[PDB]
Amino acid sequence: MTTKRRNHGRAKPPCSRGRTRPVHCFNCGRLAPKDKAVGRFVVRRMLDQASARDVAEASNVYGAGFPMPKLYMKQRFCIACAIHSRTVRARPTDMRKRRFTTKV
Amino acid sequence: DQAQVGLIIKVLGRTGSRGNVTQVRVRLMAEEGSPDANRTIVRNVKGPCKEGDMLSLMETEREARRLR
Amino acid sequence: FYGSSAAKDELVYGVVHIYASFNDTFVHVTDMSGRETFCKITGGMKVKADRDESSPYAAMMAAQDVVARCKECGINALHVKMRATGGVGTRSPGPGAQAALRALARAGMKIGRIEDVTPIPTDSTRRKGSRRGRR
């Protein structure tokens, strides 16, 4: 019916591909096309600040000695998935058209 | 029991939603210069609190809220 | 004693595999070999009721009985390897991580050279779920 979104909720432009590979979700296991799927990059700590202190005490070769590593992952979510944990939210008309590119 | 004083160093903020409990931070003045790297634990509190209030701690190494 | 008597008065590096998931938390003991071990601890021994066997409290309560058995095995320093979950599971550990570490440090064990050792695929099989997901 009505063209709600010009790009159709995709990063896939018309008249190019018409097919982009499916990708699983790290929530519910749902598949969707890669372009539709909602990418985020996490940078998840291996220790809270509160505990970081306590462990860096007992360390000598680590903590102070070398900066602590972090678990990195890419997270591709489904639409429904994203919305429900409210990391993507509905926006007014003027704002929906805005993009921030791939930068945070 | 263990009765271990601590001074409420500041009002950490508002956590919970009942209108009952607040989450506040406790600083140890219990120590005499004994090693603590904790060093200021967050503690959930029951009922009204105010800064500079001493209170006894039955537990230590509390991170309060966690992920749960 | 039972432990060190030819490595005594010197630190000894164990290795500790920590596996944190949303049904249980494990704490294991290895000696930079992985071919021999001394103790296998599960959250579920210390705390009962399946929800609370993966909770932070489970971890810490278990961790103190790591330390108890390490000082009888001559082990003092502990390398640590944090593990999330399977390669057809998620990439997130459960809440029992970050609890265990602090419990050990505070209990006078040394900690150095922590690592992230987890099974992440180059690619693997179709993930459990459906096309339409769990719902």
Next chain:
Amino acid sequence: MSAKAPKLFNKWSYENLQTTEIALSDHISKTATYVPHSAGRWQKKRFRKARIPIVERLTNGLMFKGRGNGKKLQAVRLVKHTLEIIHLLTDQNPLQVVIDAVSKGAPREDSTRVGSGGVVRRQAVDVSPMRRVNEAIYLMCKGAREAAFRNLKTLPECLADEIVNASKGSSNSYAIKKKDEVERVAKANR
């Protein structure tokens, strides 16, 4: 002179008294007035209730359940007797026994409903200073009414009994058992 600087209940002295706990010292204050009888405005602000001693607070929350109950002046008549009883039983100033009992009957840790998911979850939640005071008071003086409700032959004496056993940590007291059982859930689950 001899009632200018000197301050008594009418023979009970406030020099002897010391605050038993160091957790509480700004919610436990000393009496100087010769009756705990109230006549002021006692609340208007979040802390304005901790400017006054435990004695006054206790005597006001002593009983309720009106039907022609004589309220404050009646309560004071029982206070007098109960102080004499506590005095000869501890062989020590009754006031200072009250100071102790309020602190040692109080629950110092709690656990609450705060979870979600159709389910509840409990965590160790520390009791705030004013709450230790208040809760202890209420439990002790709840015990009193229940003890005389159809039972005993004693009118003030039950109060004296409770305040004694509370200060000893003995589990006869209505206040002590509460501290006990609550902490068996709040230090057995976090």
